[PDB]
RNA sequence: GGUCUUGUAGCUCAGUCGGUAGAGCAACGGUCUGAAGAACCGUGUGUCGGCAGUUCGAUUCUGCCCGAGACCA
RNA sequence: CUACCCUUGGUUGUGUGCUGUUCUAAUUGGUAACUGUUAUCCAGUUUCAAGACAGUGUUAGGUGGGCAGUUUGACUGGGG
RNA sequence: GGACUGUUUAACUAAAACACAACUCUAUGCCAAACCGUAAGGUGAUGUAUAUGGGGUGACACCUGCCCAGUGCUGGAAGGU
RNA sequence: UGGACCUAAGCUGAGGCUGAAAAGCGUAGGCGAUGGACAACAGGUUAAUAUUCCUGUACUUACAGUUAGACUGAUGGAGUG
RNA sequence: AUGAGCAGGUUGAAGGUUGAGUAACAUCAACUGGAGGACCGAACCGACUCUCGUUGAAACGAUAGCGGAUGACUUGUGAUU
RNA sequence: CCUGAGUAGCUCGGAAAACGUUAUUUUGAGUGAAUCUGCCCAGACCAUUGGGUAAGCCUAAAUACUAAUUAGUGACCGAUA
């Protein structure tokens, strides 16, 4: 049971503070942004210390959000698609994007990138945002035939 | 085309007819062609556990089921060459040995409109709307017949794929997705607009009238002798045996179990495409 | 098994007494929730979960 | 686990600033037609289903026993 | 005018129950791809049709001799 | 009456019973209906409504006439609970 | 010839999915002739044998060295089988 | 699932066949060919009918037909419920 | 300040309890504290008061008989036993 909405606001009463309301297995309990803290004994010891950890996490998340924006704006996603001079044979899943994310040396879960099935042809582009205050943009360069 | 069967017997008669199978199917002198061969094991209506599951079905010879590729997606951008129209011992439809020019062969359904030799392309591409071809429904306007079409992503061509089957296109929904197809048997579905389409009714439109005549043809065709409910064992059957055979009771005759099937809605609604249904001959979805 | 893969706990076999007050037995199977769970060192495997044990795990920060 | 309800003539019905009975048909009499179906009017039927509250005149405004009606454990 | 008793119509809403929806970040899946592995029963990630409706676990039901434990009274100038 | 040729009570019952046949009614849009085990899965079957299962007779031929008060089903709009 | 080999029906079975205890399904594999494939046909022999032992006729993978000879080739593809 | 008998005589079909013919038709004949839950009849099987036994040679068989005997025929082995 | 935390109370149906489930405990499911006059119990529960501080337990002894060994015993049998 998460108790800290760390560094992010999930569009509800949970705010950047040690407070959150139960929302079940959703973006409020499956996303690692809401970091779980020891609940067996959370009165004075872990409480304020985790609040300070949350403040420091806010600051380092601004820093790492800038860093990751630069990273994914310099080394970006690349993919190829099969064409016959204007003949749609496309198929897109987020699996490959997650695989590339893991290949970048960090175990990024299935939460940064998510999209539906798409069927297209030619040159296109898809961008997925990552942050709420210093948000980054993805560049998925697709190579047609 | 059909052909009469004169038994020339001294006792009994036969008005039975059989499709010639020489102008609609190749290699009448059937020798197993060892290019795409698959041995078939069977239990005689029994199951993997071993006990029977389908009564009144057995006593059939061996079959060599051709490797049918319902997806039509293995090899794209090269049109296939229909080598022959082959028999299918498991289906009423006639299989088609196509061979793409890249160096591979497969088996498909060739509907009425094309025969051996036609160059058919496989793709999600806006290719020509011809029998044997496969293309998404988005390129086909309303008022066309469609067959050999699936419901689920890469689930294999399952629905409406027999002789004389068709799917009338009647536009799409108000949401712009789930195109409405009027399938066979007077049912209607909300087919995905992205699914492929093998247009054209399956060949052999004359496969509608036939007289079995002799039991061997019937027993080898799956349907084994069907026993009437009159004059059975009074055990395991609540109407058999006894002097003065009893007329059948139990209004809307049930199957010989605790279940009912006569007239009652016995549809299954727990699948991955049950939200794409329109009409099932009695109600909605 | 009918017992979920996280708790191999035997279902409670008790009685079901109807208007006849009979001695017929009744099974009480452990709860089965195939909710997702996160594991460390790569894989992110998912197993079945019982709600009574789910309360304990969730209030012990199992996510 | 059953709490929803109407009865008024031979059948059928409703009840205004709570104030007030009724055909139609079968059919009693009459009318139409050298003859007449069909049809047309007037004879007729009611403790307003029966019991108890309501108020300027409750059977009408209300509640109750005997059958009723449309997603039921 | 100051308060109470009712009364019938209704905006913003609520004490009362009615539901419908945008998404998947759950769940169903003899849906599939990658991998294990060149593993039919398979597992991890996934998307997909729905979508927290519903399923699951529990309780609660019903249709339902298909089957059980069984019941299938007695007196009766033999018994029904 | 059964179409016929045929099959079941090996060891007193072989047929007007049963059985191919046709007439056919019913369920199923697939993960099918039906079914084996509880469960995976699987036959059905990867068959796709022109396929399978179940109902009734019965070849070949006329049709199957009259009728829903209720039940089973389908369709209906408003409930008590 | 069965196996040394191969599978059909079918089974075991690392796992694994699924199931109170027990195990079901079932994969990697391998087992499983009633079959397929690799390699002996007649005469003679004893009180008990024959294509088997010998005679004559002879096969197979050809074995290690060896000369000679020569681009052989499965882990991959196709055909007979 | 893997392998087995149908000797012999037979229906001798459908498919097509060639010319004649005819304004074009129409129409005529015949044979390649071998189809059957095909025929008579042996291998093989059946107890359908009558007799025997009714404590037989027989815990089911003997005889006479008939029937399958070129398929709903007659089987061996291994295995599945 | 510590003396056990989905833990003690209950609770949708059962069981261990004399009790076939009414005090205690119970979960397959929903829940839920105290750091001890609190909390559990006082056959609903409590006031004085009284029972105890559980939610981890270690523990040969009284709870079996010979599973290999030892020893003797016999209103034990008498080959239908």
CA A14/CA A27 separation, integer angstroms: 12
Contact B50, B43 (CB under 8 A): yes
Name the token pair of B159.
């629905």
Q: Residue B109 pairs with which residues in a beta bridge?
A: B95
CA A124/CA A90 separation, integer angstroms: 12
The residue in chain A having the minimum alpha-carbon distance to the alpha carbon of residue C35 is A25
Cβ-based contacts (< 7 Å) between C 22-61 and strand G: 29, 48
Cβ of B4 less than 7 A from strand H: yes
Q: Is B180 helix (H, G, I), strand (E, B) or coil?
A: strand
Cβ of A89 less than 7 A from strand E: no
Q: Residue B146 pairs with which residues in a beta bridge?
A: B199
CA C48/CA B60 separation, integer angstroms: 45
Closest C-alpha among B120, B186, B185, B189 to residue B150: B189
Query: How many Å from the CA of C63 to C1' of D42?
Result: 93
Nucleotides of G under 7 A from a protein CB: 8-11, 18-21, 24-26, 78-81
- Using left for φ > 0, alpha for ψ between -120 and 50, and beta otherwise, residue B59 falls in left
Query: Do residue B76 and residue A88 have CB atoms under 8 angstroms apart?
Result: no
How would you class B196 by CB atoms within 10 Å of its CB: exposed for 0-12, middle for 13-18, buried for 19 or more? buried
Contact A128, A115 (CB under 8 A): yes
Alpha-carbon gap: A47 to the closest alpha carbon of chain C (Å): 15
- Using left for φ > 0, alpha for ψ between -120 and 50, and beta otherwise, residue B239 falls in alpha
CA C36/CA C47 separation, integer angstroms: 7
Q: Is C27 helix (H, G, I), strand (E, B) or coil?
A: strand
Cα dihedral B193/B197/B135/B131 (nearest 10): -160
Name the token pair of C60.
């012990």
Q: What are the phi and psi torsion angles at B84 (to 5°)?
A: -165, 160
Query: Do residue B123 and residue A117 have CB atoms under 8 angstroms apart?
Result: no
Closest C-alpha among B201, B189, B180, B188 to residue B137: B180
| Secondary structure element (H or E) that encloses residue C55, with its range | helix C51-59
Question: Could you tell me the maximum CA-CA distance found in chain B, to the nearest angstrom?
Answer: 72
Query: Do residue A30 and residue C63 have CB atoms under 8 angstroms apart?
Result: yes
Q: Does C36 touch chain A (CB under 8 A)?
A: yes
Alpha-carbon gap: C61 to the closest alpha carbon of chain A (Å): 5
| Secondary structure element (H or E) that encloses residue B108, with its range | strand B104-109
CA A27/CA A34 separation, integer angstroms: 9
Closest nucleotide (C1' vs CA) to B153 is E31
Closest nucleotide (C1' vs CA) to C30 is I28
Q: What are the phi and psi torsion angles at B138 (to 5°)?
A: -65, -30
Closest C-alpha among A16, A2, A3 to residue A132: A16
- What pairing do the DSSP bridges indicate for beta strands B104-109 and B119-120? unpaired
With b for 16 or more beta-carbon neighbours within 10 A and e for fewer, the B40-76 pattern comes to: eeeeebeeeeeeeeeeeeeeeeeebbbebbbbbeebb
Q: Assign 3-class secondary structure to chain A.
A: CCCCECCCCCCCCCCCECCCCCCCCCCCCCCCCCCCCCCCCCCCHHHHHHHHHHHHHHHHHHHHHHHHHHHHHHCCEEEECCCCCCCCCCCCCCHHHHHHHHHCCCCCCCCCCCCCCCCCCCCCCCCCCCCCCCCCCCCEEEECC
CA B87/CA B82 separation, integer angstroms: 14
**What resolution in Å is listed for this PDB structure?**
16.0
CA B58/CA A34 separation, integer angstroms: 61
Full strand arrangement of the beta sheet holding B277-279: B168-169, B179-182, B188-191, B277-279
Residue with tokens 């060739």: B110
CA B262/CA C1 separation, integer angstroms: 37
Provide DSSP, B239-284: T--SSS-PPP-SSSPPPSSS---SSS------SSSGGGEEE-SSSB
Alpha-carbon gap: C63 to the closest alpha carbon of chain A (Å): 6
Residue with tokens 């695989």: A99
Q: Does A89 touch chain B (CB under 8 A)?
A: yes
Half-sphere exposure of B145 (CA within 13 A, CB side): 17
Cβ of C11 less than 7 A from strand G: yes
Q: Does C33 touch chain A (CB under 8 A)?
A: no
| Secondary structure element (H or E) that encloses residue C59, with its range | helix C51-59
- Which chain A residues contact residue B153 at CB under 8 A? 117
Q: Residue A79 pairs with which residues in a beta bridge?
A: A142
CA B207/CA B203 separation, integer angstroms: 9
> What method was applied to determine this entry?
cryo-EM
Cβ of C54 less than 7 A from strand I: yes
CA B212/CA A41 separation, integer angstroms: 81
CA A122/CA A145 separation, integer angstroms: 8
Closest C-alpha among B42, B93, B49 to residue B64: B42
Cβ-based contacts (< 7 Å) between B 69-88 and strand H: none
CA A29/CA B228 separation, integer angstroms: 62
Q: Is B216 helix (H, G, I), strand (E, B) or coil?
A: helix
- What pairing do the DSSP bridges indicate for beta strands B196-199 and B146-147? antiparallel
Query: Do residue C35 and residue A25 have CB atoms under 8 angstroms apart?
Result: yes
How many residues would you count in chain A? Answer: 145
Query: How many Å from the CA of B9 to C1' of H31?
Result: 23
CA C8/CA A137 separation, integer angstroms: 47
């Amino acid at each position: 049971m998460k108790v800290i909405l760390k560094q992010d606001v999930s569009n509800l009463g949970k705010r950047f503070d040690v407070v959150d309301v139960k929302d079940g297995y959703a973006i409020h309990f499956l996303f690692p942004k809401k970091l779980a803290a020891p609940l067996t004994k959370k009165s004075l010891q872990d409480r304020d210390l985790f609040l300070k950890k949350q403040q420091e996490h806010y600051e380092i998340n601004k820093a790492l959000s800038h860093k990751l924006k630069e990273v994914i704006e310099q080394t970006e996603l690349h993919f190829s698609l099969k064409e016959h001079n204007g003949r749609p044979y496309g198929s897109i899943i987020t699996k490959q994007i997650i695989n590339q994310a893991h290949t970048k040396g960090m175990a990024l879960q299935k939460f940064m990138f998510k999209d539906n099935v798409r069927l297209g042809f030619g040159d296109h582009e898809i961008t997925l945002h990552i942050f709420e205050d210093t948000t980054a943009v993805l560049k998925v360069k697709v190579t047609p035939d | 085309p059909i052909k009469k069967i004169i038994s020339r017997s001294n006792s009994g008669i036969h008005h039975s007819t059989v499709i010639d199978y020489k102008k609609l199917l190749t290699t009448n002198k059937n020798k197993p062609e060892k290019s795409l061969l698959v041995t078939l094991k069977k239990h005689g209506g029994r199951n993997n556990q071993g006990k029977i599951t389908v009564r009144h079905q057995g006593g059939r010879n061996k079959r060599k089921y051709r490797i049918i590729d319902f997806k039509r997606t293995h090899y794209d951008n090269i049109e296939a060459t229909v080598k022959s129209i082959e028999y299918d011992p498991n289906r009423s439809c006639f299989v088609s040995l196509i061979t793409y020019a890249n160096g591979a062969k497969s088996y498909i359904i060739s509907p009425d409109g094309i025969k051996v030799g036609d160059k058919i392309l496989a793709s999600e591409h806006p290719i020509d709307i011809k029998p044997g071809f496969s293309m998404p429904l988005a390129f086909i306007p309303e008022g066309t017949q469609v067959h050999n079409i699936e419901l689920h992503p890469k689930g294999g061509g399952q629905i409406a794929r027999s002789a004389g089957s068709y799917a009338r296109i009647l536009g799409q929904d108000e949401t712009g997705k789930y195109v409405i197809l009027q399938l066979l048997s007077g049912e209607t579905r909300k087919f995905l607009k992205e699914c492929r389409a093998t247009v054209g009714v399956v060949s052999n439109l004359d496969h509608n009238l036939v007289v079995i005549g002799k039991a061997g043809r019937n027993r080898h065709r799956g349907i084994r002798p069907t026993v009437r409910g009159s004059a059975m064992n009074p055990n395991d059957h609540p109407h058999g045996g006894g002097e003065g055979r009893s007329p059948v009771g139990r209004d809307a005759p049930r199957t010989p179990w605790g279940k009912r099937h006569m007239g009652v809605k016995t549809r299954n609604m727990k699948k991955a495409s049950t939200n794409l249904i329109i009409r099932n001959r009695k109600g909605e979805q | 098994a009918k017992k979920d893969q996280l708790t191999l706990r035997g279902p409670l076999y008790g009685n079901n007494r109807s208007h006849s007050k009979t001695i017929t037995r009744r099974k009480w199977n452990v709860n089965l929730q195939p909710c997702k769970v996160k594991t460390a060192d790569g894989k992110t495997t998912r197993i079945l979960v019982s709600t009574r044990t789910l309360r304990t795990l969730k209030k012990h920060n199992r996510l």
